[PDB]
Design an enzyme around this catalytic site. Structure first.
Site: not given
Lengths: 299, 603, 603
Positions: C304, C340
């Site tokens: 992330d 991401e």
């Protein structure tokens, strides 16, 4: 002023100045007012002070901020207290006319009435409260057609104003509230002087309860403003005052004559000699819901 | 008891601004008391040579409000110590946050038990300090990093006592009223200039003991100079042995993870919501004003406290800032507070009771940016940018301002003030003389960082000393003379003391082509006229309106060769010609030297 | 000794990708070996019950590359330990970064987590899964991920989460019932703040204590594999947790954090970013990725906030990211890496040799933002934002994307997915099925976070279990039933497996007034037709061009009564009409139900 060398159009800047110079030379008692939504300085200042030479400037800052605060639901007004109180840091930069205009009630921006949050009684209360603050706030006053009844729809020029709304109590009442507001303005010289000397803070930190107290004074004359921006009435609320003695409430937004709940201070409000808000005496008052209280010492 | 049951009640409130006396290390005749705030600690101990550095021998006992106290017999002044705090499973060694003296063990920091005993020689100064009244008197601030100012040999700074007599004379010769000292509080990275602080209660060791600094202030006070300290309540230093996660948890830090991330400083901002942080910070304010008699505190990066960058603004900081100032002035009616806020937050210099932050002064960063931006440009370029120059006065009265040229403007590739100025060496020297001349004329108080007075070419380097080799060169000596003359005029003429709108009158602002502006400074009867020629073409038979007729004097000539100019001067007592010019009854027909300022006073 | 000359050589190089073989605490039946990396420490010692927590009993020895090692007789599994590191004047207790398990000795909800000597031995039975597991080739296989927070998913008792073992059978049963291929678990690495959800990591090599021992987690993954479910782990190389005994200032100086003072300032985290320049940091991080894939048989890793890594451009981060992915697929050819990245940084999903970052998958947040924004609007207004829906296909092929609905999107006042949709409850459920229908039809792999499959009313609260009580109501069991059937379609019909541009055809996008979309999904002979009505008004006799003529069957209808719909549809067989429409030879004349998706197959 701005075409967007520099961005300024000096042609226009000299035209504006020579415009004002010529008008006031040929008609010394005329009035010129400007609307400028940039923060151009000294709009209302004389050309010989490097100003544009208008006598008056619309306070668009006051209106945008003020309207933005009024639009927010009272539960949230807690969190934007600095928006309401900070308007006065800018209230003396120019000779200012607080203005509510056709521009604010068109193109889906909504009626002043529509702008106000809550139930119907609350809309009238909030709308009555705003006008109270607009008149109490330093600066001259401008209000566009239909706001004085608090008409529902945006201003539609192809048609007539909603005069039929004058039969319903809430709307005939806001009209009555404005009438008396103008009467107070016309008669009390404490409101004529929009300078910093003409305004004094009473208290601004009742941010949870969203209450604001300020004073407008010229010489002997005093006018006290207490504003309750929440539907909660507040009881045993103390407000500092400069002088002690008998005080009467000359205006109560929540009076039944305006369509309000009807709380307020009917009997003589006598000052209590205990220091409050850094003031020698204080009044213990009852603040009606979404209402503005205007108080005068008795002569 | 070391600590009263009342003192703890004051701690819970955040209303102990004398917390220094209870906290930190306090020597008595048989030992010293130690007092530390560590609320979320299971045990707190003091370790030192006086107990063989063993945690068990002296463990502090908790009182109210997470306050630890204990007495160690045999703990003596000059001893080094450290607190070993245990948060459950883990232990860590810490510095005393209230340490009044820190000395490095390496010699390249360990808290030292110290006594602050000092007998003062500045009684006369304190009685006369102006404080709020200073607004109507002149303030001319000389900004200094003590390490950078003067050196005994390359890489060797001056001590506190030693610098006093050399510095006090230089400051006096130039007529400055105060020195603003970049933060003297103990900081590990010298290259930070003092802005990342470990010992808020400890003056930096590099220049001496606490007593060495106290005397420096003593001397500067006796010689009639004020001392302003730069203060960093906005953030705290990164190094762990310090304030970071003091009790094993967030303490000076924000407890909540969302608030702790912040621009510029992250998880290094003070949690102003905590009462203990407010005690620590506000006590430090008075501590400097009390034990060292400082005249002023200058708060930097005020915008970083005000905003978080639901309300974007941080109220905890906003009320802290307000109550900081409120405490300063109630306890010290003649103290001085300055704020640097690079935002238009209104009423920074305004009183708290009017919803202001309560500072006495705000740095006029707008003026600085505008002024520097205007004169960076070519004189042929200036006529297009002339409005930038004149519009400075639209914002000159919003706050009580100090016009500021700071160290930051002379670092990080921005170039020395000299370097910024355009043209040849003569024109550059003229432009700086014009800059300072205009700055003293502009309403507002004055601050200049070291080296601006001799126009040093080099950007400020903390590892070096300013280029005094330049004092020998003529243009630089002339710029020094020009600054001294402006200060002398500032010290004498009351027309420049009153920075209100009353104190300034426009004479002419519309000579857009030749880039000339004429303005007036008035207090009561007294008048001073300022004519500014911002382009190298000299102008003869230039007419300037005047309110008063009669003999006019040329009080200062930027181009007088004593400053290094072409020496072109009116060199005469001007007589006002009663023919109207500039909407004034009279006018003066004067000669404007190249890139020069004339200051004219009626005789 | 403990460290061979090859081991120190690789660590200095930044090549020790199995470093857990030697770092941390390694038990032996007689005693435990300890190895910790602290180059700027003057002394390091192991403390534990096994030596009366005395720091001088066992001082590790300095080897090369700043590596410390020592053996302690009597240190046994389950014994708690701590490292005592001395940095000159100061000492501090620190946790093991390579801890294989951490535990609160206290048992308290807020407590220090203590490293515990651990044996990682475990015999696996997931043979069939790992021999047939497919990583990078999954690009052409259906991937449907169920995102999970283990503590929040289901509660064994109020306020009590399930064990790694206790959850195993319930979670596997649930996922199989709804047909997801993988589960993504929010970071299971040891984290101090349960409220962090695992993104503040202290023990990168230790599974969190809250759900059990390491072997419990290995068992959970083993069990899930035997049940045919893949396990994707969330991994956090971008930043580490701020806890005072943790990785922060490990040796008393900067170690895992950037040495430079300036490039420490970071907007997302700051001070707590990993210094990818250091070979030791690169060792620690890249070994950890391999550690989980090796010792815990993990199928995938999802990183992330990659944008926080790439920019400060951080070449070292990007080369770390590149060498991370290169190294992963080198050691585990069938692993999966997902990123991401909230910038439009190109080639996230691209191979390193093509100047890409080297992940196999990128979260399609562009898709997520647009779709939710479009569906937040009332059907009356969707008419005016038609391009927001259709233009997602301009961006659907830049990367190998996983369309993502995540916990981030249903928290902090963003509203539950159910809450986001407009109208009455029937309409919100109708719309939610349409969003799920479109997400499954749209190119890309699929990810759905817990609670979306039944359309939970309330935002995800980590302190609670999902509102399973809502499963009694008709709308919520229907949405769950609709998701199951969508997943059944996904796993069997290969037309949805190829998310390449070849796999998608537009049939119509210009129905802006009625807000209808027809698109086609194809692989070779196989075809799937999608007709979507985003307004509650049904449309009858709607003609939709088709490539092939003949009998068409309606395989799925979001409006079927079994899903909670009105029950309109095209009954059974539909026959294409040989008349041209949408530039196509044939067309189906269909009835489009309210707020519904039809999925149609040739017969």
């Amino acid at each position: 002023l701005y075409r967007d060398g520099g961005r300024e159009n000096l042609e226009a800047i000299d035209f504006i100045k020579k415009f004002n110079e010529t008008v006031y030379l040929h008609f010394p008692e005329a009035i010129t007012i400007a609307e400028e939504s940039t923060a151009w300085p000294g709009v209302s200042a004389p050309t010989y002070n490097n100003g544009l030479g208008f006598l008056y400037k619309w306070n668009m800052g006051w209106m945008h901020d003020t309207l933005d605060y009024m639009r927010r639901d009272p539960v949230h007004r807690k969190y934007h207290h600095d928006t309401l109180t900070f308007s006065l840091w800018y209230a003396f930069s120019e000779h200012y006319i607080l203005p509510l205009s056709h521009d604010e009630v068109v193109h889906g921006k909504g009626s002043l009435w529509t702008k106000m949050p809550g139930d119907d009684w609350q809309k009238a209360a909030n709308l009555r409260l705003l006008y109270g603050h607009m008149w109490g706030h330093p600066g001259k006053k401008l209000l566009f057609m239909g706001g004085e009844f608090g008409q529902h729809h945006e201003w539609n020029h192809d048609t007539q104003l909603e005069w039929h709304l004058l039969d319903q109590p809430y709307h005939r009442g806001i009209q009555a509230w404005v009438r008396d507001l103008n009467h107070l303005y016309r008669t009390h010289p404490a409101l004529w002087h929009d300078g910093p000397e003409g305004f004094e803070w009473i208290d601004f930190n009742d941010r949870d309860q969203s209450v604001i107290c300020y004073l407008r004074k010229h010489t002997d004359r005093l006018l006290l403003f207490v504003l309750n921006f929440t539907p909660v009435p507040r009881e045993h609320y103390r407000v500092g005052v400069p002088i002690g003695g008998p005080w009467r409430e000359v205006l109560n937004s929540d009076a039944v004559a305006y369509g309000g709940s009807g709380m307020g201070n009917f009997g003589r409000v006598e000052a209590v000699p205990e220091s409050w808000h850094g003031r020698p005496f204080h009044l213990e008052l009852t603040l009606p819901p979404l209402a503005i209280l205007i108080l005068e010492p008795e002569s | 008891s070391w600590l009263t049951e009342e003192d703890i009640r004051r701690w819970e409130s955040g209303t102990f601004y004398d917390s220094y006396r209870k906290l930190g290390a306090h020597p008595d005749e048989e030992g010293t008391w130690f007092c530390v705030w560590a609320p979320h600690a299971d045990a707190v101990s003091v370790l030192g040579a006086f107990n063989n550095w063993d945690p068990e021998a002296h463990q502090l006992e908790r009182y109210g409000a997470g306050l630890w106290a204990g007495y160690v017999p045999g703990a003596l002044p000059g001893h080094a110590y450290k607190y070993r705090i245990r948060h459950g499973f883990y232990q860590a060694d810490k510095t005393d946050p209230y340490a009044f003296a820190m000395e490095p063990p390496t010699g390249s920091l360990a808290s030292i038990i110290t006594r602050l005993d000092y007998t003062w020689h500045d009684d006369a100064w304190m009685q006369r300090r102006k404080g709020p009244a200073s607004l109507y008197e002149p303030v001319s601030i000389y900004e200094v990093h003590l390490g950078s100012w003067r050196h005994k040999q390359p890489g060797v700074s001056f001590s506190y006592r030693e610098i006093a007599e050399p510095l006090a004379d230089y400051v006096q010769d130039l007529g400055f009223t105060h020195v603003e000292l970049l933060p003297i509080m103990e900081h590990p990275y010298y290259g930070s200039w003092g802005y990342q602080v470990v010992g808020y209660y400890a003056p930096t060791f590099r220049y001496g003991t606490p007593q060495d600094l106290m005397y420096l202030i003593d001397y500067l006070h006796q010689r009639g100079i004020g001392v302003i300290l730069d203060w960093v309540p906005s953030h705290f230093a990164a190094d762990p042995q310090g304030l970071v996660y003091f009790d094993g948890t967030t303490l000076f830090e924000y407890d909540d993870p969302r608030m702790r991330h912040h621009p510029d400083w992250g998880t290094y901002v003070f949690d102003y919501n905590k009462p203990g942080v407010r005690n620590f910070l506000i006590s430090n304010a008075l501590f400097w004003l009390d034990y060292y008699h400082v005249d002023g505190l200058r708060v930097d990066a005020v915008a970083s406290m005000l905003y978080r960058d639901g309300g974007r603004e941080n109220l905890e900081a906003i009320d802290f800032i307000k109550k900081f100032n409120e405490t300063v002035y109630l306890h010290f009616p003649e103290a001085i507070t300055i704020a640097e806020e690079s935002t238009a937050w209104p009423g920074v210099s305004a009183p708290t009771y009017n919803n202001g932050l309560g500072f006495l002064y705000k740095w006029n960063m707008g003026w600085m940016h505008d002024t520097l931006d205007y004169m960076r440009r070519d004189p042929v370029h200036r006529k297009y940018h002339h409005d930038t120059l004149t519009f400075s006065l639209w914002y000159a009265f919003s706050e009580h301002y100090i016009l500021p040229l700071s160290h930051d403007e002379v670092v990080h590739g921005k170039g020395s003030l000299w370097t910024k100025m355009p043209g040849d060496d003569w024109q550059k020297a003229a432009n700086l003389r014009l800059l300072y001349g205009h700055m003293w004329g502009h309403p507002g108080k004055k601050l200049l960082f070291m080296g601006g007075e001799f126009g040093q070419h080099h950007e400020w380097n903390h590892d070096t000393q300013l280029e005094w080799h330049l004092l020998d060169q003529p243009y630089h000596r002339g710029i020094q003379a020009w600054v001294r003359d402006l200060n002398h005029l500032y010290r004498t003429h009351p027309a420049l003391w009153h920075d209100g709108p009353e104190g300034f009158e426009w004479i002419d602002f519309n000579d857009r082509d030749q880039s000339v502006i004429c303005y007036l400074r008035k207090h009561t009867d007294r008048l001073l006229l300022f004519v500014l020629n911002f382009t190298p073409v000299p102008r003869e038979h230039y007419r300037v309106g005047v309110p008063i007729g009669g003999p006019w004097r040329e009080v200062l000539n930027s181009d007088a060769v004593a400053y290094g100019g072409s020496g072109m001067g009116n060199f005469g007592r001007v007589e006002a010609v009663p023919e109207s010019w500039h909407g004034r009854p009279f006018h003066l027909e004067l000669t404007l030297p190249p890139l020069a300022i004339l200051i004219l006073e009626p005789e």
